[PDB]
Structures are given as C-alpha cells and as structure tokens.
Design a protein around this ligand. Structure first.
Ligand SMILES: COc1ccc([C@@H]2N[C@@H](C)[C@@H](O)[C@H]2O)cc1
Length: 438
C-alpha cells in the first residue's frame, strides 16, 4: 500500500445527486470548435489526414501565424438556441464544449490572454451563449479544457532547468486563473474534462492536478472532474499507484469500448467514452472521405454498449467555421434522436444488468428492475437467447414500442428463447423483460 499525498480522493462511486445526474444523463454530445475549423485540415493547399484540430502541429505553423486566424473568426450563422434545439432533438442530456483546445484560443473572453473570442470580428462570448442556450433546454454543460497550450510561451513539455521550472510555475498560475474564471463566469457548469495532461511537466507536478480538482470542487458544488486530469506523487495517471481511480469517473475508450465479456471491471466505477464520427477527426475537417465514417446504427450500437456496461457515451461534433453543422452531422443527430425517442427508456437512467452477454445485442437495466434487451443482430433462428443469473426468472416480455406480448419459452434450467417480434422492426429494437428474483 504505497502512501500518497495526491492519489485517489473517492473510494467507490459518488452517489450525490449531481453525480447521479451525470450518470443518468448517459447520452451527451461533444463540441470541438476552435480556430482549426477555419482551415479545416488544409494548410497552403495541402490537406492533412491527421486530426484537423492538430493541424498547427502537422503543418508546423508558428503560433503567431496560427493565431492570426482569429482575424477570420466570424461565424455569422452561429445561433446558440438553434444548437441547443439540435441537441435537444438528438436526445442528448448534456454537451461537453472545448472552452480552449491545445491551440489556446478561448471561446470565452478570458482576461488572462488576448487569444480569445473578444479579439475577433465576431466579438461575442460563444461559450456564454451556449451555456445559456443549452441550460434553457434543460441540458447540462461540461467544459473541455486543454492544459497543454501552444499559445503560451511559458508552457513546457518537460522541466530540464530552473528556467523551465520558473516558466512552468507561471504557466500553472495562468492555468489556475483561467479555470477559476470558467468556474465563476459559468457557474452552472457540471463537469471539467481535462486534456493535454500527459507531458512529463504535468506528470512531474501531480500535486497541481489534485489542487486543480480540489479548487474546482470548492468553486462549483457537485462538479465532476475526469480521470485524465490526474497524476499522483509518482506521476501515474488516471489510476494512482495503488490502482485507485483518480477524479470522479474514468475517461477513455475513445478508440475501443470495454469488451462486454472480459472488461466487466469497468462496472465498478463511473466512466465515459467519447467518440468521433470519422475514425479520428474531432475538429471540423473538410474531407471526410479520408477515413471510415460511422453510420448512425454504428454509433447507436456504441451508445448502448456503453450503457450496458455502466458508462456514458458522448458523440462528437466539429462545427463549421460559419457556425453551422455539416450535413452528415445533422443527419446523424436526427437519426439518433428518432431512435432515442422510440427506445430511450433503455438508455436514460440505465446501467449494467448483470446478465451474461449474448450475440443479439445488449442488456440494460432500468431504475425499477426493468431489463431491456436491445437487439442489433437479428437471429435467423428467430429466437433470442437469454441466460439468467441464478435465482432470476423471466416472467414476461413485451415489445417496448407497441406493448405487444412476446413469447418466452424456457429451454433449460437458466435459459430461455425470447421470440423476435411478429413483424421485423427493421432497425435495432427493444424488448422489455419483467424479471423476478427468489
Ligand atoms: C494520441 O494523442 C492524442 C492527443 C490529443 C487528442 C485530443 N483528445 C481528444 C478528445 C481531442 O481533443 C483530440 O485532439 C487525441 C489524441
């Protein structure tokens, strides 16, 4: 048992109302919007296949020159109420917003740097307007923040000297000032999601990560903080050197979700996956033909998969420079919202059901012991196998959308065949089980 000043703070899941709301939300959207939306992955006639929000790096653009993009920041089609409506229709319960990405351009009028929205033709506090607009739709708002900041010369990747070390303290101070500003200007914020905390400079200053979490929790009651912020005394990140989760929930599973058979350990803590629609574009990139683009059913599968394992899923959007959304993204949000509007009773406020995974899809459990079968792979057998845990029996099955009764047959001791519906629903669909325990 290694002793640590800056390791894990929670032991187990938070059960306060604010974390319960975080959890019960389940479905969110991510907004990556920044100066990178203007060049859209293209610099001086070259289209880069890398993530558009890292274009500064790929095209080796100097900061002075990258930040001059502020002169072009004027999203005349931007309308916060329209964004909030789109989110509401999609069925999202929260939105995570890049307040500042690695480039260091702030979407709120920070007084601690001139690289902000206030110094652009558009002038307006984009972040403030989104906060209000989402909140008026009853949508929670979470703040992405990049500690790594390519706009501030005090930033260091490592500390190799007194001069580094001095510069970096000033950088941490600046960072604290920005975070305080965010927390006080936008007091309805429910979460800070840190990024760009993997450099040796940050790993060598875990104390700062614990301080940042504490400071923010003091300023914003109930706020959630992600694991990626956090490094312990030994520089170990996400989980401390005793294997205990730091922050309030695990943030990962960006490429791959936990395996539904081998990774059941995740059910023991809150966690949240965030995904891109293309393979790896978060900011707006003009050419989506460069990588595979997920269809709505692929995305819905991922959303349900996360909830079936006690996790939230967040779907990313990279708005256009003009302040509108590209057609693929509007289509995606609409598809998802139609599906959520028929089947969201099996997503919202649901969790791990404790049933052995089957090939036809996923189980989720409702707040009142409902067990939902979410079918993504329709068996030619027309039989959906359900293997119950010891002492559990299935008393009824019902098609969620129509209420029709669905036949359940016991095949052996802890096992049933739940028939598919009389008419193929033609999309992923839900059957609700009434189950009874000894
Ligand atoms: C493997 O290196 C990285 C570094 C930064 C990222 C950033 N985290 C995502 C959520 C976006 O903000 C992306 O640019 C992704 C991968």
């Amino acid at each position: 048992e290694i002793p640590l000043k800056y390791g894990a703070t929670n032991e187990g899941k938070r059960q306060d109302p604010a974390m319960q709301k975080f959890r019960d939300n389940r479905l969110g959207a991510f907004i990556h919007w920044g100066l990178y939306a203007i060049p859209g992955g293209e610099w001086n006639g070259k289209v880069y296949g890398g993530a558009a929000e890292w274009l500064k790096s790929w095209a080796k653009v100097p900061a002075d020159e990258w930040l001059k993009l502020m002169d072009q920041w004027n999203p005349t089609k931007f309308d916060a109420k329209k964004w909030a409506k789109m989110a509401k229709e999609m069925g999202t319960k929260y939105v995570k917003i890049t307040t500042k990405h690695h480039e260091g351009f702030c979407l709120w009028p920070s007084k601690y740097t001139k690289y902000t929205v206030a110094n652009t033709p558009y002038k307006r506090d984009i972040l403030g307007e989104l906060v209000k607009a989402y909140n008026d739709e009853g949508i929670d708002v979470h703040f992405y923040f990049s500690v790594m900041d390519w706009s501030n010369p005090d930033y260091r990747y490592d500390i190799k000297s007194k001069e580094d070390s001095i510069a970096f303290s000033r950088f941490l101070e600046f960072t604290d000032n920005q975070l305080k500003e965010l927390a006080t200007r936008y007091p309805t914020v429910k979460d800070f999601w840190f990024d760009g905390t993997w450099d040796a400079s940050v790993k060598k200053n875990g104390w700062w990560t614990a301080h940042a979490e504490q400071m923010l929790k003091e300023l914003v009651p109930g706020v959630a903080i992600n694991s990626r912020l956090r490094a312990d005394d030994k520089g170990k990140r996400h989980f401390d050197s005793n294997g205990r989760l730091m922050g309030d929930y695990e943030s990962g599973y960006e490429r791959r979700l936990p395996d539904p058979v081998k990774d059941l350990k995740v059910t023991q803590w809150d966690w949240e996956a965030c995904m891109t629609i293309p393979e790896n574009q978060w900011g707006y990139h003009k050419d989506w033909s460069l990588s595979y683009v997920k269809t709505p059913i692929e995305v819905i599968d991922r959303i349900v998969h996360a909830v079936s394992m006690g996790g939230n899923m967040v779907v990313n959007f990279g708005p256009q420079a003009d302040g509108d959304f590209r057609p693929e993204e509007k289509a995606m949000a609409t598809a998802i919202g139609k599906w959520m509007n028929r089947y969201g009773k099996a997503v919202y406020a649901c969790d791990y059901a404790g049933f052995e995974k089957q090939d036809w899809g996923y189980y989720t459990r409702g707040k009142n012991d409902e067990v939902y079968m979410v079918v993504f792979n329709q068996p030619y057998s027309e039989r959906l196998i359900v293997k119950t845990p010891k002492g559990i029996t299935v008393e009824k099955a019902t098609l969620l959308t129509t209420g029709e009764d669905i036949t359940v047959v016991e095949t052996t001791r802890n096992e049933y065949n739940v028939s598919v519906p009389k008419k193929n629903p033609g999309e992923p669909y839900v059957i609700q089980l009434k189950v009874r325990a000894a």
